[PDB]
Amino acid sequence: IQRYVRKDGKCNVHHGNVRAETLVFSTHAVISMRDGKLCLMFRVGDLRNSHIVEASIRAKLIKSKQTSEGEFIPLNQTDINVGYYTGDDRLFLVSPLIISHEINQQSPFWEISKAQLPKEELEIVVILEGMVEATGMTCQARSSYITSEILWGYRFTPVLTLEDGFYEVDYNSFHETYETSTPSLSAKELAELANR
Amino acid sequence: IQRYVRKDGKCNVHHGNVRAETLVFSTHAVISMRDGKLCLMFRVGDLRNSHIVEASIRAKLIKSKQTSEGEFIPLNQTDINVGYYTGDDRLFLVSPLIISHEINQQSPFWEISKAQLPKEELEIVVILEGMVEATGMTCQARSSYITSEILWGYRFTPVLTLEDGFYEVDYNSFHETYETSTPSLSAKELAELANR
Amino acid sequence: IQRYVRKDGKCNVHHGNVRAETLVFSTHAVISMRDGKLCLMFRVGDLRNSHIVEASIRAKLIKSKQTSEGEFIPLNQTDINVGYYTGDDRLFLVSPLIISHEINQQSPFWEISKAQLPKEELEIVVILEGMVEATGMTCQARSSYITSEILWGYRFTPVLTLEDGFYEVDYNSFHETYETSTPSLSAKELAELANR
Amino acid sequence: IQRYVRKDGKCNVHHGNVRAETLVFSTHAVISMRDGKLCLMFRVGDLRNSHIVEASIRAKLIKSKQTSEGEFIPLNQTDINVGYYTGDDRLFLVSPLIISHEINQQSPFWEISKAQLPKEELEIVVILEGMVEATGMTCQARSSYITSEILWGYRFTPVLTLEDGFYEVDYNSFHETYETSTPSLSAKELAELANR
Numbered sequence A, B, C, D: 001i002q003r004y005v006r007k008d009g010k011c012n013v014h015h016g017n018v019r020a021e022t023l024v025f026s027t028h029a030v031i032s033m034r035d036g037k038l039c040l041m042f043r044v045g046d047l048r049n050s051h052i053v054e055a056s057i058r059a060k061l062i063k064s065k066q067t068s069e070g071e072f073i074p075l076n077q078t079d080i081n082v083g084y085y086t087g088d089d090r091l092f093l094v095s096p097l098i099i100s101h102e103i104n105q106q107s108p109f110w111e112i113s114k115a116q117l118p119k120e121e122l123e124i125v126v127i128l129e130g131m132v133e134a135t136g137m138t139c140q141a142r143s144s145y146i147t148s149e150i151l152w153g154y155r156f157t158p159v160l161t162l163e164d165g166f167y168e169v170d171y172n173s174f175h176e177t178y179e180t181s182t183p184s185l186s187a188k189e190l191a192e193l194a195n196r
């Protein structure tokens, strides 16, 4: 077994790195099953020449809404769960990671099917926050996924390969995704159906 | 659909901004229903020429009290829930936001009606904390709402409009509020009544 | 009603302050009832000439212990709950505050009576952490309470008084405490007794 | 009773310290019972000549996996619970500490027995994060434990001794461990067995 991180803390990625260049999120996001739960996932990249300490990820849902009392909220924000409750939003970014938001009863996508999706008017803001080790300072990097940019029933291509006691990232594959069998029911719908 | 945040992370607000000037909270706060829950809301502004990273909001209730054992606490503090449990207190401040505190059993306003309000001796301290991107440093901004400054049964006027592929903020409307039909019972009272 | 914090964020404490000097905890800590719950409380002071942003408080229990399997832990640490779950450990330090730890089933003092106390071999480490506004940097301040320094059945004297539209702190009273009727049973004991 | 931390905040460790040198984790990690729960523990050292403020610890499990739907995740990460929920991951590092992760239903080691262990292909990444008081800046220190480096049924040797009103650390013992009677069943197995 070849290690990912060595005893002294130095990682075994990007052979001959030196741990501005900017961080990248995948251009699209995907939705598909993982151990029987429907998930939304987007890929967040790393920085080729330094770690990001106290790194964390969050997401906001931007969607205008009307409260049952007629109050209309343009571009309302609501937090999307991507690990906050278990500290899985506290990232160890040393290679591109697939962030996953399980679509459960408390997710805003709970009632959105595949057909329902391209009709909805919404945007997901993805915000990475950490301290650039080398730089000393607090960075923030943002990106955005609009409806048309969320691909139902796809999955992210892997980019990680072990080569000669070092792990290397084929950054070409970063944004690439492939298709997989995926039900077109809504999370909610899937849940009711399984519940009988 | 015109985006709020572009793929590269640059927002589409305040056409031709350059992302000291000071942040502003609304002068008053309002109380009114949102999807059948009574809420207290105050508006928190943004900074016209920079983001605030790791931005977060909290509120303290200042009200002198007497413990059942006679211990009198002058200006006692207790935390007001404004998203802490779900990370909705972690703000993405790129335009004035309405912060909302749902008045539930664990809120201090649970037993305060409309008539009861102007009688109570209390103050809400609102504290924004984040890192000014441009400046590098940790800022804090504070404000305060006393009883007379909490308007029962009102709502905040919207200030957000889409113009020419950019969203613009009519800062005149920032502090302005309007009236809406709102029961004058206390949260607690409303709850009991609905519970039968 | 005279405000504690003004609309522009400036507080109304310490008339003519300018918002190194060091922060002070009370020399002793006290234990006594608050709304029918037994509490341990110590007082944490403020800094006369600046705020402390992102201020937070925590406490550690240092007590050597033996695991049921004979493993002996010298000076074992375990966290004492002082608001962590509700964000009441996130302080708004603009005048000396009484920090309170409710002694419940999950507290380490759950089974410690008044008589039992002076026999136990333990220490409470109190750690304040925040960013000194003026200084720019992250401070930490520590103190410690050993058994003999925890006064059962006392309460903290108030130090806060309103004078001429400003609130002033009689720093003489800071460490002073007085006595109050307080049962000498353990929290656990009190609980069982009330439970019948 | 000789104190660990003095009233003024100065600790009573490392007689004549001055509160780069690098922090050290133990070379191995151990698994063994503590009050009837099976735990995984590794030791994290302190820094001989300065405190680490806002110090915190986290751990990641790196293990490649296949989702029930065939999606294969190379070097998947998942957070290991080491105090996050109760703030026991917020460390008071003034002498080497044994960090403990209780192996419960939500731990990834729930179904891993002693025999099962050396077969599994996994790695634990341990990440300390804090602010070096003297330095002003945010540090991160990392280490790693692979299967062969996790010793089933051992415990950490104590290194802490009281000498002349000061506590001293025999840094020789730091990495040393000894054996203890320890069941070779999996946590899960132990649980089922006790549940009847």
Ligand SMILES: [Ba+2]
Pocket (backbone or CB within 6 Å): none
């Ligand atoms: Ba920080």
